Amino acid sequence: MLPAPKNLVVSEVTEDSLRLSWTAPDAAFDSFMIQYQESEKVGEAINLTVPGSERSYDLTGLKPGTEYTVSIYGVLVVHKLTFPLSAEFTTGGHH
Amino acid sequence: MLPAPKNLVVSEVTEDSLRLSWTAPDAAFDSFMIQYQESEKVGEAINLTVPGSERSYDLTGLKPGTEYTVSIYGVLVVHKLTFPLSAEFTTGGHHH
Known part of the structure; x- marks a missing residue:
């Protein structure tokens, strides 16, 4: 429903890591879903979660000189509420 | 997303109360929402929450000989997921 996080950049890069930074509105999300894969074809994309109050994450364990799609x-x-189950009942005694 | 609680009955009725009873799969829900109102008209519907492990609730303080819609x-x-935001970054060092 709500619009995507914005402004995905790195604040730090090393030979085996990418320190991600992004923006999102306050209290908007409970978590962030992070999916990263080599921009070539060395398999499948890896999925991670991060708390929704966080705006940075150290992606570690990466290959040197390698482009990742993040x-x-x-x-x-x-x-959410289910479709209502409804019924009418009458209380005891005289109206 | 998923189908509903079932079999809404009363297990007990007095001149000012309705003891609701229902069924649900164990741990299917975290809470139930219960809405009730006089079936004619005397204001607005009242909402209450009950823990999802409960299968019974006493509606209290009602009127005698009066139909309520529950x-x-x-x-x-x-x-839920947003649309993704995607970017490409290259790690440092040489690309062996």
């Missing part, structure tokens, strides 16, 4: 999703816990 | 909803917790 996707961030805001995760929203929605509290 | 609705019960299970509260479901859903995880």
